[PDB]
Design a binder for these strands. Structure first.
Ligand code: MG
Ligand code: MG
Lengths: 122, 156, 1202
RNA sequence: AAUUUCUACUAAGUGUAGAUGGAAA
């Protein structure tokens, strides 16, 4: 079939995601997962993606009024911008570290489908 | 005269917080030293009101008593007798040499009812009082410099 | 007799009041006619100018005589130091030679053309005249002594004590140790010597002296000693211009040319020390800020040097670039590693692989020693950070790209702020009302300041091994310039946060340098100041020096117009006034005295030291007694009634007796019409002591200071508040003008702002201007008193509170703990553990006449922090919030004081140094230290104003239950009635039994989670209660050497918070996960089934539910409604504690919510300290430890309830 | 929104309730 359509659609989705992953961290940036991609991928008949997680609801973006359990935050408050930055810094790095673990799963899917059928996607 | 006021006090406050670990000798001599240092910082703050008769104020044997108890070396003061710093016995003395000066000009004799010779002895006793108290104060700064450059702490 | 009947009259004090002073009658126009303000306005302003003139002459003196000294021991110091040393007390001879050299330049100064008339009186008189400055230095012709705060320090400039600001220490131990260093480093510039560059121009246009090797050979140190020689030396280093466009080269540039072969590795010649900010107007501060941070400023060039330094950083070794241990070390480690605790963890493992045994469990004492050994180290090497780092982590790239990110961030904020350093810049609004300009300046200053704080840790306090001196030599040479930004930060910040008004004042002297020192009758014609009462409008009297006896010849008037008048007889300092008078050449010629008495005082056996003899000093006591009887002033004016001669075991006792008695103020009358006619003649000046309580409308309680000052002239004033001397007077200026005050008009309904007033709007009949007090001028007056001058119940308070608390049998305890919900939460605990009274301190009751109108501060705080949010978080909002917190911790102290009196207690208080607490109370940490200060200040002298003055607890017999504050560490572990207690494990603790979680259940791997889930005892499920009962011992877990029970039967029910903000069921969530994974979970233990699965997400969504079974604190963080503390372990009655179960009672027996629980645990720790106070002798009470450990505390809080 | 001074006030109408230790670099 014409699985190239689904693959190029996925590839451009990758090229938006990896383009500005950082504005996904903002509360209300112009943006808008895995079950939808697997739904649009099962319909054409590919193998699925084998993601790292499906639940997605713990990537911290701007609930800066809506959490506490971080030992690292306690360590930051252990010794007297300033602190604010440590809390903002740690959640930003945790968000980026979550999203690239997402992104590597799509690149792994494309490498598997690349070196099985001899096409080119990266 | 507010920014530098807070700055010079929080610098020194950070040093008094910081030097509570450097000693690492027998005991908590930092308490006696900071108590002495704040005593210095009152003394040198208003030495001048010690000259007044009844200012809000109130030596060396007491400091050596509170210093021997913790086990420091003592201070090696300049004097212990203390009873000749002139403050407001302006009715209770005469022997000074500068009557030769005051008689070189007109002035008057040794009777202080004249309003001109009054300040002309008040100046000299004020300067002698300040000159006594800074000779006191230098002894405390010498003690702190000796204890500073023997054990590597910071006090001035 | 309760626990406060002891603690009064324990030690001295010295408050000082501050009332206003309005002149009465024609006194103000009399002052303006006799022109007594212009003189002291000059005597304030001209002082820095005359200081400038005397500093000019002093520096001319130094540069004068330094052209006449050639040091002789200099060769013998230089060669003997640069000799390779190998001392064996030869460095001691070096230091002897150094102090002798300082003595040589000291002797040069001593004989330097007099110099004895350099700090005496005639320096303002004689030498300094020989322009229009003759009146300037002649403005102080009858007034010399105000220079004595200058003549001491400028004398100490000429000492030899190796002090900092002095000449001698500089020119011998900084200049010479730079000079001989450059002398040795001259050996490493001889390979680049091109005479066309180093000799053909420098020697011809600088000195025409002997050549460049003379400055490195050591026999023009005596020529370079002057500042002209330092000028020539720094010209040969840097390069003179000689007012021509050549920009002639220097030795720094000639050594900079050597790294053309990309290898410098030769240190340059360090420049020599020579020998000796805004805050007014908007155009000036903008220009100086432009001067200090434009695109060619010195600080900005320092950033450019630093960024190129860290660009070419890789050439230096990684063995010397020491990173500073401490606060910033964790932040620096976190950026490269990606984890804050990675550096601490690697050092932890590196230490425990040596000192830990072949087991793995720890003790808390070994942990505290571990933390002490980690804080033992001074700094870390970059090589050790590469050692910590695993593969693909090169710090020489990682830190370089971080710092270039920061420098490019400063360049981007320059790209933001580039409209500010332009020549055609405009100020459209003043900085008080403008926002964009000042926030731009704020972003610039904070960005460069953050850059400095990031760079800061590359010092290592060194003091090191072979550190990279070729790197540090330019690093500090840029960092000294980067540290100058604090002079701009603490200029701009305190410029913008200052008030529109201004509190500058000058001391008023009234033509006399000897002014109001005392209040002694028979010295009042000298001091020239007295105080008159009449009804209650008090008065201050100033007599002019032309007519300095206008109060002596006054009759006791009988036409009933009178001012009562003080007399104020004070014997000053009787331990060292009596030998000053009774041996002073006129008393020795009026009394005889006896020969043995003169000898016994001259040898001085009345003092201590074992020469102390009772029946020998008793004759001296009798001599003092009889002579004071014979003295005319002191036989009459006091009522001296001593003990007998055998009733003084110490002359210190007799001195205390005469110091106790020798003070009496009475009132002999005077006229009124003759006094007011006299002040109409102008021979008197008369001011009324006044504040907002001497008015005739004050229908309430006064200020406490006016209560003291009205109590200074009572017949109750024996017990004892002595009006001292040292009084001053001051004068302000009209900071504001009258017109531009925003004035509320009369007869209009004016607004309100406290929302809990039933009178939601009011109106007045007259005006109420904004800040009327700075419209005119006002005479501030100060009148310093000395409360409890003679102390009686004298003892060590820190031991007396303990020996009181042991013998006590039901000692109350207050606790005070910060909380997220409430900034301060009070809990009062009995001697058992029952919570007597628990309440918040967000609402402030003002219990005046009958009308308990409350006011909130919590709403005020959040309503001002929203303005902080919407106003880009600028300095005015910050300092407004800091002052609002300061007012709040003022008004707490009345509640704490009254609570201490009402319950007879000892305050507990959260220690700070131990910390280890989130402390999310929405208040700054510093504000708590200020609360410490403004609590121990007030509990130095506790008094409540509504009480009667004579009765105990009043303004005469106040409570003293603390010591004075000493220093920010010496406030620890006891202070009188304030105890300091570490705040560890005080908020997250079940109050019923004492279960605390200690389980690190942040998910790491199934490799850890399988063992962690097998370590539990019995995970089952009860169907007749629908609970997921867990079970465990604690001894099979790491970090667990503190609990005592270790048999914790957990459960599940009660509401919990899940991010999803959302609400989830603890036991329904467990059931839905176990029905997601298809279990017959009703035959526990089910760990055998749970150790079979192999997908990650099951265990990742199980760890996040274990943690929610353990999370006791619940904050919805958007509303104050549900902040509920729930504990998943139940007590003997089978019910586990819920906060909302205990909120809806009147007086609970357990804490209401989280902050109250945080208070109640602190109270419990002090109760344990009291329990150990009850279990020692009175000979170890000064040594009984209070620092209760985590193990001890958890043991007590579990076995208290049973 | 008035103050010896500071904070929160308008508190019965030129103030209320608490606090406040000043000069000096
Ligand atoms: Mg009042
Ligand atoms: Mg106000």
């Amino acid at each position: 079939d014409e699985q190239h359509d689904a693959l190029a659609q996925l590839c451009a989705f990758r090229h938006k995601f990896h383009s500005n992953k950082d504005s996904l961290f903002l509360s209300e940036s112009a943006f808008s997962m895995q079950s939808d991609e697997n739904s649009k991928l099962r319909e054409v008949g590919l193998p699925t993606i084998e993601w790292s997680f499906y639940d997605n609801s713990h990537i911290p973006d701007d609930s800066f009024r809506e959490w506490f359990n971080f030992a690292n935050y306690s360590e930051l408050s252990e010794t007297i911008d300033e602190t604010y930055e440590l809390v903002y810094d740690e959640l930003y790095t945790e968000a980026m570290g979550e999203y690239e673990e997402l992104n590597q799963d799509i690149e792994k899917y494309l490498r598997r489908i690349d070196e099985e059928h001899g096409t080119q996607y990266c | 005269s507010k920014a530098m006021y807070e700055a010079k006090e929080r610098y020194a406050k950070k040093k008094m917080q910081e030097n509570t670990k450097i000693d690492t000798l027998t005991d908590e001599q930092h308490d006696a030293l900071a108590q002495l240092c704040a005593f210095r910082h009152k003394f040198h703050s208003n030495k001048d009101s010690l000259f007044l008769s009844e200012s809000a104020f109130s030596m060396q044997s007491d400091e050596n008593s509170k210093l021997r108890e913790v086990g420091l070396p003592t201070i090696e003061w300049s004097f212990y007798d203390n009873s000749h710093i002139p403050d407001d016995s302006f009715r209770e003395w005469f022997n000074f040499a500068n009557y030769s000066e005051l008689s070189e000009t007109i002035g008057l004799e040794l009777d202080l009812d004249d309003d001109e010779t009054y300040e002309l002895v008040y100046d000299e006793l004020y300067t002698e009082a300040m000159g006594e108290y800074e000779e006191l104060n230098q002894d405390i700064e010498k003690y702190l410099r000796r204890i500073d450059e023997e054990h590597g702490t910071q006090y001035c | 007799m309760s626990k406060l009947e002891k603690f009064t009259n324990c030690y001295s004090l010295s408050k000082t009041l501050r009332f206003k002073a309005i002149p009465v009658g024609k006194t103000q126009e009399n002052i303006d006619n006799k022109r007594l303000l212009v003189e002291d306005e000059k005597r304030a302003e001209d002082y820095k100018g005359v200081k400038k003139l005397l500093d000019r002459y002093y520096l001319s003196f130094i540069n004068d005589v330094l052209h006449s000294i050639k040091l002789k021991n200099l060769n013998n110091y230089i060669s003997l130091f640069r000799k390779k040393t190998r001392t064996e007390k030869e460095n001691k001879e070096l230091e002897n030679l150094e102090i002798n050299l300082r003595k040589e330049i000291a002797k040069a100064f001593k004989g330097n053309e007099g110099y004895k008339s350099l700090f005496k009186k005639d320096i303002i008189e004689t030498i300094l005249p020989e322009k229009d400055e003759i009146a300037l230095v002649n403005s102080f012709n009858g007034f010399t002594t105000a220079f004595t705060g200058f003549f001491d320090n400028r004398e100490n400039m000429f000492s030899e004590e190796a002090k900092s600001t002095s000449i001698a220490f500089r020119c011998i131990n900084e200049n010479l140790t730079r000079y001989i260093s450059n002398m040795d480093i001259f050996e490493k510039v001889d390979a680049i010597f091109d005479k066309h560059e180093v000799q053909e121009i420098k020697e011809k246009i600088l000195n025409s002296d002997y050549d460049v090797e003379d400055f490195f050979e050591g026999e023009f140190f005596n020529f370079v000693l002057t500042q002209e020689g330092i000028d020539v030396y720094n010209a040969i280093i840097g390069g003179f211009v000689t007012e021509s466009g050549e920009k002639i080269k220097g030795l720094n540039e000639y050594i900079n040319l050597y790294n053309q072969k990309t290898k410098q590795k030769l240190p340059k010649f360090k420049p020599l020390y020579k020998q000796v900010e805004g805050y007014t107007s908007d155009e000036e501060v903008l220009e100086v800020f432009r001067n200090t941070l434009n695109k060619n400023s010195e600080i900005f060039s320092s950033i450019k040097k630093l960024e190129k330094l860290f660009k070419n950083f890789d050439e230096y070794s990684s063995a010397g670039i020491f990173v500073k241990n401490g606060p910033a070390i964790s932040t620096i480690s976190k950026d490269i590693f990606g984890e804050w605790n990675v550096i601490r963890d690697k050092w932890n493992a590196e230490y425990d692989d040596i000192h830990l045994k072949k087991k793995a469990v720890v003790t808390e004492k070994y942990e505290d020693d571990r933390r002490k050994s980690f804080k033992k180290i001074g700094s870390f090497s970059l090589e050790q950070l590469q050692e910590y780092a695993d593969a693909d982590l090169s710090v020489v790239e990682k830190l370089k790209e971080i710092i270039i990110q920061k420098v490019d961030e400063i360049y981007k904020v320059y790209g933001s702020s580039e409209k500010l350093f332009d020549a055609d810049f405009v100020l459209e609004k003043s900085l008080k009302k403008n926002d964009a300009v000042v926030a731009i300046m704020k972003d610039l200053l904070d960005s460069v300041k953050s850059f400095e704080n990031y760079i800061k840790a590359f010092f290592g306090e060194g003091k090191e091994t072979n550190r990279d001196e070729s790197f540090y030599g330019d690093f500090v040479l840029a960092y000294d310039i980067l540290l100058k930004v604090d002079h701009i930060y603490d200029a701009i910040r305190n410029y913008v946060t200052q008030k529109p008004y201004s509190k500058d004042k000058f001391k008023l002297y009234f033509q006399n340098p000897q002014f109001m020192g005392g209040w002694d009758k028979d010295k009042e014609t000298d001091y020239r100041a007295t105080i008159l009462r009449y009804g209650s409008k008090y008065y201050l009297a100033i007599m002019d020096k032309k007519y300095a006896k206008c109060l002596q010849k006054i009759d006791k008037d009988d036409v009933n117009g009178n001012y009562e008048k003080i007399n104020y007889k004070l014997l000053p300092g009787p331990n060292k006034m009596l030998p000053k008078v009774f041996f002073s050449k006129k008393w020795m010629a009026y009394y005889n005295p006896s020969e043995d008495i003169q000898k016994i005082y001259k040898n001085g056996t009345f003092k201590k030291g074992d020469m102390f003899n009772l029946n020998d000093c008793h004759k001296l006591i009798d001599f003092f007694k009889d002579s004071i009887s014979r003295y005319p002033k002191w036989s009459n004016a006091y009522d001296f009634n001593f003990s007998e001669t055998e009733k003084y075991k110490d002359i210190a006792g007799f001195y205390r007796e005469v110091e106790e008695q020798g003070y009496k103020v009475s009132f002999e009358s005077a006229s009124k019409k003759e006094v007011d006619k006299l002040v109409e003649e102008g021979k008197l000046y008369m001011f009324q002591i006044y504040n907002k309580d001497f008015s005739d409308k004050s229908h309430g309680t006064p200020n406490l200071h006016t209560m003291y000052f009205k109590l200074l002239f009572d017949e109750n004033n024996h017990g004892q508040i002595r009006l001292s001397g040292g009084a001053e007077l001051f004068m302000r200026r009209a900071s504001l003008k009258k017109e531009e005050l925003v004035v509320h008009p009369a007869n209009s309904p004016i607004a309100n702002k406290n929302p809990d007033n039933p009178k939601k709007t009011t109106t007045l009949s007259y005006d109420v201007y904004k800040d009327k007090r700075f419209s005119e001028d006002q005479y501030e007056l100060h009148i310093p008193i000395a409360i409890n001058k003679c102390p009686k119940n004298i003892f060590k308070i820190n031991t007396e509170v303990r020996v009181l608390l042991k013998h006590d049998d039901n000692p109350y305890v207050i606790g005070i703990d910060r909380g997220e919900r409430n900034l301060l939460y009070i809990v009062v605990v009995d001697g058992k553990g029952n919570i007597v009274e628990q309440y918040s301190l967000n609402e402030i009751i003002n219990n005046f006449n009958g009308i308990r109108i409350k006011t909130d501060y919590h709403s005020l705080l959040d309503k001002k922090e929203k303005e902080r949010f919407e106003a880009r978080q600028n300095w005015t909002s910050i300092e407004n919030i800091k002052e609002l917190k300061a007012g709040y911790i003022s008004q707490v102290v009345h509640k704490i004081c009254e609570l201490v009196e009402k319950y007879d207690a000892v305050i507990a208080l959260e220690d700070l140094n131990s910390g280890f607490k989130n402390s999310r109370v929405k208040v700054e940490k510093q504000v708590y230290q200020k609360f410490e200060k403004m609590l121990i200040d007030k509990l130095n002298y506790m008094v409540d104003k509504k009480s009667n003055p004579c009765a105990t607890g009043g303004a005469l017999k106040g409570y003293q239950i603390t010591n004075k504050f000493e220093s920010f560490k010496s406030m620890s572990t006891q202070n009188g009635f304030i105890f300091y207690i570490p705040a560890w494990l005080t908020s997250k603790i079940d109050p019923s039994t004492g279960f605390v979680n200690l389980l690190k259940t942040k998910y790491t791997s199934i490799a850890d989670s399988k063992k962690f889930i097998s370590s539990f005892d019995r995970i089952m499920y009860v169907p007749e209660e629908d609970l997921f009962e867990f079970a465990l011992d604690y001894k099979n877990f790491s970090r667990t050497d503190a609990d005592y029970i270790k048999k914790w039967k957990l459960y599940s029910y009660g509401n919990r918070i899940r991010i999803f903000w959302e609400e989830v069921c603890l036991t329904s969530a467990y059931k839905e996960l176990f029905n997601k994974y298809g279990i017959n979970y009703q035959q526990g233990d089910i760990r055998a089934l749970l150790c079979e699965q192999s997908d990650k997400a099951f265990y990742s969504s199980f760890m996040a539910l274990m943690s929610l079974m353990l999370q006791m604190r619940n904050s919805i963080t958007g509303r104050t409604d549900v902040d509920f503390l729930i504990s998943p372990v139940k007590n003997s009655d089978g019910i586990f504690y819920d906060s909302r179960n205990y909120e809806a009672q009147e007086n609970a027996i357990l804490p209401k919510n989280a902050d109250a629980n945080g208070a109640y645990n602190i109270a419990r720790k002090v109760l344990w300290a009291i329990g150990q106070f009850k279990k020692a002798e009175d000979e170890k009470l000064d040594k009984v430890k209070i620092a209760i450990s985590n193990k001890e505390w958890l043991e007590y809080a579990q076995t208290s309830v049973k």
